[PDB]
Amino acid sequence: TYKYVNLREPSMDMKSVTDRAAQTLLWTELIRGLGMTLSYLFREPATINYPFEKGPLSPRFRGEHALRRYPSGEERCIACKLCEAVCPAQAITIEAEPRADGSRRTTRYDIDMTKCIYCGFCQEACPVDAIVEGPNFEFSTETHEELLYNKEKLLNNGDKWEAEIAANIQADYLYR
Amino acid sequence: NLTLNFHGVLRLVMELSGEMVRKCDPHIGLLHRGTEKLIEYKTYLQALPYFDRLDYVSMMCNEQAYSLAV
Amino acid sequence: MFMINILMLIIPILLAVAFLTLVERKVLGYMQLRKGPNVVGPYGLLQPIADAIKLFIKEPLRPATSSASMFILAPIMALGLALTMWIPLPMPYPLINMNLGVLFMLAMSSLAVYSILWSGWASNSKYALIGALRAVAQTISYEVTLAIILLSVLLMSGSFTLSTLITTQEQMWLILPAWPLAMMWFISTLAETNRAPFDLTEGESELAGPFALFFMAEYANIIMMNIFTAILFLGTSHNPHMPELYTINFTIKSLLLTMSFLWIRASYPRFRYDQLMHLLWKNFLPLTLALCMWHVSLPILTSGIPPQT
Amino acid sequence: SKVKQDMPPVGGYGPIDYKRNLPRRGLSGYSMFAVGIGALLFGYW
Amino acid sequence: ELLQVLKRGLQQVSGHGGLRGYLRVLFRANDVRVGTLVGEDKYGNKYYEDNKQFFGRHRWVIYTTEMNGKNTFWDVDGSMVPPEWHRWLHCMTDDPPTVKPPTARKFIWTNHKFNLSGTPQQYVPYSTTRKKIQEWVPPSTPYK
Amino acid sequence: GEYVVAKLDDLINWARRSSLWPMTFGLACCAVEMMHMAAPRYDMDRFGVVFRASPRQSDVMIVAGTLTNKMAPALRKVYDQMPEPRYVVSMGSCANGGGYYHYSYSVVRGCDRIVPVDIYVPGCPPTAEALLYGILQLQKKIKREKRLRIWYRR
Amino acid sequence: MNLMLALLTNFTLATLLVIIAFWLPQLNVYSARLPFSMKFFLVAITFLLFDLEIALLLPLPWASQTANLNTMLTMALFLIILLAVSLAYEWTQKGLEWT
Ligand SMILES: CCCCCCCCCCCCCCCCCC(=O)OC[C@H](COP(=O)(O)OCCN)OC(=O)CCCCCCCCCCCCCCCCC
Ligand SMILES: CCCCCCCCCCCCO[C@@H]1O[C@H](CO)[C@@H](O[C@H]2O[C@H](CO)[C@@H](O)[C@H](O)[C@H]2O)[C@H](O)[C@H]1O
Ligand code: SF4
Ligand code: SF4
Ligand code: SF4
């Protein structure tokens, strides 16, 4: 099924021809366009007062990464390296060894935030909810080196943002 | 024939005679990033996000085309 | 006392231009469902000052100019001419009362094209000279209709004195007997000042201190065209014992016409170069010539010839 | 517990416009010319 | 209604506790709207809502003038919002932390920090792993 | 002599950060989010950031997208033509360090190999709000400048 | 006198702003034929010729005070009509096309 967007014959009777002549000489369609921009002048603008107001986001928002803990404070990450395997950008680098208590834990967990594409595949792959993309998006830096996160940086993000991260996961985990 | 040397970024090499355009020669590759080669080092899931970044105005349509093929 | 008076004209003009840039950005913003400058000062009232200071301490980057003399002349000519256009304006009294004030304004604006020409010669670049020659060809073309339209209007006024236009419109605005000429006059001012939808220097080029001075000259001209349009077609009644009543009514009309330039810029796409030339040579010029013929005949056939003085 | 999923309301959503709606305004060409000529004549007088 | 519009404008001066408070919010936040005080966090940020305003402007924060020893009268920053209010301010939820407080954990930062980039507190990357190859150390007693 | 210099820094710093005119290298995806920061919700113009300016009038270059090897010389040429003071904002993973094309034979691994960068905005793409946070951060950086204080201590 | 002072002030101020615009601290311690159409020459020349005849129309506001209105009106229209013939000639000889 189709329709023609521009297949019409103008009426060539004198009244129609004078209507087109009046439009040409008196600029009527142009005046109508001015009415439209005038109507917008008196409309309330759509601008929000950043940073005092913020754009709406949802619990699924993919922002700055962070490493999480169990309620006891033990790390959730068990160095399975599934995040590192799935990462489309190869932005994750991991090393691990048996910890002094025999636990399976990482000794390196780096995310190159300038390789990362913020796709969220790592938090989908993680079997224990250790690596997440948090809700923060206001972490621009003055140097490139500040965006090469190591494990310390990522654990601090987890301790910094856990209150919000736990609430967001609560809101969306039944969709996962 | 006056020669002029100049969505993304484009380089147009044009030949004009007065107001008219005799020849338009688009010089592209300014955003060539070897996506097709990079996909050969990805799993099928790992390749999917590359399709968001082709026509990066129609992201999920590009996703759909790749998904249907797979 | 006269040097005080000169300064009471010059300094306010530059202030009005500075804050026209704020008003343009806010009016365009609100027509675009946004706000425009509202952070730098309350309601953006300090934005012009920040922009002006920023421009004047920017690095003045001079490329190898072909002619140093002509690199300095063009902005001096542009700014000096723009300021000069204001000295015969009756608001309601002119700074200088010229018997031939309308001709003086016609004579002075016809020299404004030299700054475009000299800046292309000073640009030391073939493409900049070509762009400057296109702008000149556009400017001089619309000078043709403006002069003929102006003569047609003055056949109802009877004088080249600007303050006579006030007397002529004592009972009624000239827009009523002359709205076809007012329509083409107004469009001609837009194309004359290279304003949208005739902003082809910006459009074609797209495909610090000295820059600011050219900008101030251009915006001083835009206000002055619209002041002139207000005097020519929307004459304000003048009461000799309360001259400030004229100035307020006069100012409001001028501001509204100036904002209509802004309104128009927000509403239309741009002309193609050949298309705006056709608009003048094949549309406005034929109709202005016919209306010049008509307006020579009309006072004679109605017995409405105005007085010589 | 019963399955709970994003679904349309029972009976569906209300109608949604999509056709072009550019309403006709203004006078005929005759009337517009008549007003313009009338204005000129008053101004001349 | 032109009178009622001006009355509301005058009520905003009173709503901000006089002309000084009115001018303070005008010059700090470029906005003089009066809203309902939803709450205040431990850093002095205050949170307001007005559900007559369109989505996006119906919630806002007035940043404290002093945070973690930094003068923030003029230098406000989006990172100054602590996580528990961050969820509410960005409309990830409808419940402010006053009504639905976050779950308490011993390792959660008691004191929020804003973006520290460009300061002496900035993050500096380094390798977190230990040396892998151990060099032989020659004896300290001669016997060539 | 020292009170004056501090106040004069404050004035010129205020003027430059209050009037930041960007030239946008809209190279790829990230340029879309830049357009959204110009769009009504955020309206960069309300901060004194003009929608578009030519390079010769520009104070800040926003590198919004992947920088290919083919494009690098042109980007450097535009930067060299900017009058000073000039600043560069690197927007998004590609410009930051190559991002998703970091291992490509045809891609510059970060625009800071070509030009000095003042601010790095993370994300793929950063949200329009995230870019605006970056721009405001650059304004704060300009506010910390002490050009005349260092000049008079020379 | 007043006119000469006004002119001197305008361009003197423009000169001062320009030279000041060029000199500020900085604080730094370290003859051919243009490939341009014959069409643009004809626009300039056409403007010139039309401008010369507008010079002849400028006196019309004064001429309408004449007692010899028969002659004045005829000559005024004769001039404008010849101006229209000039345009019609340019137009029909393709002097106004840009292609
Ligand atoms: C009793 C006897 C009396 C004798 C005298 C009788 C005379 C009265 C009847 C005649 C009235 C003449 C009308 C005069 C206006 C000029 C008309 C005109 O030239 O318009 C045509 C022009 C081109 O039209 P186009 O459709 O593109 O193509 C036709 C050419 N082939 O189209 C255009 O010009 C388009 C305009 C371009 C500018 C667009 C931007 C602004 C538009 C909105 C402006 C709003 C109005 C401004 C008013 C100013 C007031 C000071
Ligand atoms: C209109 C009223 C204004 C009143 C304010 C008066 C304040 C006078 C102090 C001006 C200080 C200018 O500050 C200085 O400006 C010049 C631009 O020309 C900049 O640029 C300068 O420095 C850089 C290196 O730093 C040079 O490579 C460059 O060639 C040079 O132009 C400087 O980076 C900036 O430090
Ligand atoms: S968000 Fe995607 S690109 Fe970034 S670390 Fe996780 S898996 Fe890798
Ligand atoms: S973060 Fe999760 S997926 Fe990655 S290594 Fe640790 S446990 Fe495995
Ligand atoms: S950083 Fe991401 S969004 Fe930006 S250009 Fe690169 S792939 Fe596209």
Short mmCIF file of C-alpha atoms in Angstrom, two decimals, chain A residues 3-170:
data_model
loop_
_atom_site.label_atom_id
_atom_site.label_comp_id
_atom_site.label_asym_id
_atom_site.label_seq_id
_atom_site.Cartn_x
_atom_site.Cartn_y
_atom_site.Cartn_z
CA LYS A 3 0.38 7.06 -1.25
CA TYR A 4 1.54 9.94 -3.42
CA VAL A 5 3.20 12.74 -1.47
CA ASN A 6 3.16 15.34 -4.26
CA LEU A 7 0.79 14.43 -7.13
CA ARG A 8 -1.77 17.23 -7.45
CA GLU A 9 -2.96 19.55 -10.22
CA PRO A 10 -3.58 23.17 -9.15
CA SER A 11 -7.03 24.49 -9.97
CA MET A 12 -6.79 26.89 -12.91
CA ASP A 13 -10.03 28.75 -12.31
CA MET A 14 -9.76 32.48 -11.76
CA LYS A 15 -10.48 32.35 -8.02
CA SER A 16 -7.74 29.77 -7.46
CA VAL A 17 -5.30 31.65 -9.69
CA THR A 18 -5.93 34.87 -7.78
CA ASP A 19 -5.41 33.02 -4.49
CA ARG A 20 -1.96 31.93 -5.66
CA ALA A 21 -1.25 35.44 -6.95
CA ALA A 22 -2.21 36.90 -3.56
CA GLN A 23 0.06 34.40 -1.82
CA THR A 24 2.95 35.31 -4.14
CA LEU A 25 2.58 39.08 -3.83
CA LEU A 26 1.38 39.36 -0.22
CA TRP A 27 3.75 36.68 1.15
CA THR A 28 0.98 34.86 3.00
CA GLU A 29 2.73 31.55 3.66
CA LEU A 30 5.76 33.42 4.97
CA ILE A 31 3.55 35.34 7.40
CA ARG A 32 2.10 32.02 8.53
CA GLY A 33 5.61 30.76 9.27
CA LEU A 34 6.23 33.84 11.39
CA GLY A 35 3.14 32.98 13.41
CA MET A 36 4.65 29.62 14.31
CA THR A 37 7.93 31.00 15.67
CA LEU A 38 5.94 33.70 17.46
CA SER A 39 3.84 31.03 19.16
CA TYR A 40 7.02 29.36 20.43
CA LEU A 41 8.29 32.65 21.89
CA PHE A 42 5.41 32.49 24.39
CA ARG A 43 5.83 28.79 25.17
CA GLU A 44 7.62 27.76 28.33
CA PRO A 45 11.12 26.59 27.33
CA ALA A 46 12.23 23.00 27.78
CA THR A 47 15.55 23.91 29.42
CA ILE A 48 16.44 22.47 32.83
CA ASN A 49 18.71 24.29 35.28
CA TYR A 50 21.80 22.09 35.29
CA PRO A 51 23.56 21.29 37.66
CA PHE A 52 20.77 22.27 40.06
CA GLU A 53 18.38 20.07 38.04
CA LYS A 54 19.28 16.80 36.36
CA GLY A 55 18.02 14.82 33.41
CA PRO A 56 15.93 11.79 34.36
CA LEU A 57 17.65 8.41 34.35
CA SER A 58 16.50 4.88 35.14
CA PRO A 59 17.95 2.12 37.35
CA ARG A 60 19.48 0.49 34.26
CA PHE A 61 21.67 3.50 33.44
CA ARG A 62 25.17 2.42 32.47
CA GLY A 63 27.67 4.76 34.13
CA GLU A 64 30.98 4.62 35.99
CA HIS A 65 32.16 1.14 36.96
CA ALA A 66 32.64 -0.15 40.50
CA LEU A 67 33.57 -3.35 42.34
CA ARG A 68 31.11 -4.55 44.98
CA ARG A 69 31.20 -6.43 48.27
CA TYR A 70 29.05 -8.84 50.22
CA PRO A 71 27.34 -7.50 53.35
CA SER A 72 30.27 -8.84 55.40
CA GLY A 73 32.75 -6.71 53.43
CA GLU A 74 34.26 -9.62 51.52
CA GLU A 75 34.77 -8.84 47.84
CA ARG A 76 32.23 -10.37 45.50
CA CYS A 77 34.81 -10.80 42.73
CA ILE A 78 36.26 -14.33 42.56
CA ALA A 79 38.57 -13.74 39.57
CA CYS A 80 36.59 -15.92 37.18
CA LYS A 81 37.67 -13.57 34.33
CA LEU A 82 34.30 -13.82 32.56
CA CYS A 83 34.10 -10.03 32.39
CA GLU A 84 37.56 -9.89 30.82
CA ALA A 85 36.59 -12.55 28.28
CA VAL A 86 33.35 -10.87 27.19
CA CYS A 87 34.62 -7.25 27.13
CA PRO A 88 34.21 -6.07 23.50
CA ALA A 89 36.99 -3.49 23.96
CA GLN A 90 39.48 -5.66 25.88
CA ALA A 91 39.30 -2.89 28.47
CA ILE A 92 39.65 -5.27 31.47
CA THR A 93 42.94 -6.73 32.70
CA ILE A 94 42.97 -9.26 35.54
CA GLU A 95 45.55 -11.21 37.53
CA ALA A 96 44.79 -13.48 40.46
CA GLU A 97 46.35 -15.82 43.00
CA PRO A 98 45.29 -17.65 46.16
CA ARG A 99 44.94 -15.06 48.89
CA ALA A 100 46.74 -15.55 52.19
CA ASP A 101 43.56 -17.17 53.54
CA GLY A 102 43.34 -19.43 50.48
CA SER A 103 40.53 -17.47 48.83
CA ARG A 104 40.27 -17.02 45.06
CA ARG A 105 40.83 -13.27 44.61
CA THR A 106 42.28 -10.79 42.14
CA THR A 107 45.63 -9.06 42.51
CA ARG A 108 45.05 -6.92 39.41
CA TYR A 109 41.70 -5.61 38.22
CA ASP A 110 42.18 -2.72 35.78
CA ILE A 111 39.59 -1.08 33.56
CA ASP A 112 40.90 1.29 30.91
CA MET A 113 37.97 3.71 30.89
CA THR A 114 39.24 5.16 27.60
CA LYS A 115 39.03 1.74 25.94
CA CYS A 116 35.67 0.94 27.53
CA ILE A 117 32.49 1.37 25.50
CA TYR A 118 30.16 1.35 28.53
CA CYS A 119 28.22 -1.52 27.00
CA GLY A 120 27.45 -3.27 30.30
CA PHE A 121 28.46 -6.72 29.03
CA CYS A 122 30.81 -7.20 31.99
CA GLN A 123 28.04 -6.74 34.55
CA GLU A 124 25.86 -9.21 32.60
CA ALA A 125 28.66 -11.78 32.52
CA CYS A 126 29.63 -11.53 36.18
CA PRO A 127 28.11 -14.52 38.04
CA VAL A 128 28.29 -12.84 41.47
CA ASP A 129 27.34 -9.20 40.75
CA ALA A 130 30.89 -8.04 41.49
CA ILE A 131 31.47 -5.63 38.60
CA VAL A 132 28.69 -3.16 37.84
CA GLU A 133 28.21 0.05 35.93
CA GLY A 134 27.04 2.52 38.54
CA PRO A 135 24.85 5.59 38.26
CA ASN A 136 27.65 8.18 38.24
CA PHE A 137 28.36 9.98 34.98
CA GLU A 138 30.12 13.13 36.25
CA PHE A 139 33.73 11.96 36.47
CA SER A 140 35.61 13.75 33.71
CA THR A 141 39.29 14.37 34.38
CA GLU A 142 42.08 16.77 33.48
CA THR A 143 44.47 13.98 32.46
CA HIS A 144 44.31 10.75 30.52
CA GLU A 145 46.07 8.78 33.27
CA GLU A 146 43.28 9.44 35.78
CA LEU A 147 40.94 7.33 33.60
CA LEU A 148 43.07 4.15 33.84
CA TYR A 149 41.37 2.53 36.83
CA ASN A 150 43.09 -0.09 38.96
CA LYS A 151 41.53 -2.30 41.62
CA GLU A 152 41.92 0.29 44.39
CA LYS A 153 40.06 2.92 42.37
CA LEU A 154 37.29 0.45 41.53
CA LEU A 155 36.85 -0.78 45.11
CA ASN A 156 36.61 2.81 46.34
CA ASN A 157 33.91 3.49 43.75
CA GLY A 158 32.09 0.48 45.16
CA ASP A 159 32.40 1.78 48.72
CA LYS A 160 31.48 5.28 47.55
CA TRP A 161 28.38 4.40 45.51
CA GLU A 162 27.12 1.15 47.06
CA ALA A 163 24.10 2.81 48.68
CA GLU A 164 22.73 3.83 45.28
CA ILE A 165 24.06 0.79 43.40
CA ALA A 166 22.32 -1.61 45.78
CA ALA A 167 19.02 0.25 45.41
CA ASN A 168 19.25 0.29 41.60
CA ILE A 169 20.04 -3.44 41.45
CA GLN A 170 17.04 -4.04 43.70
#
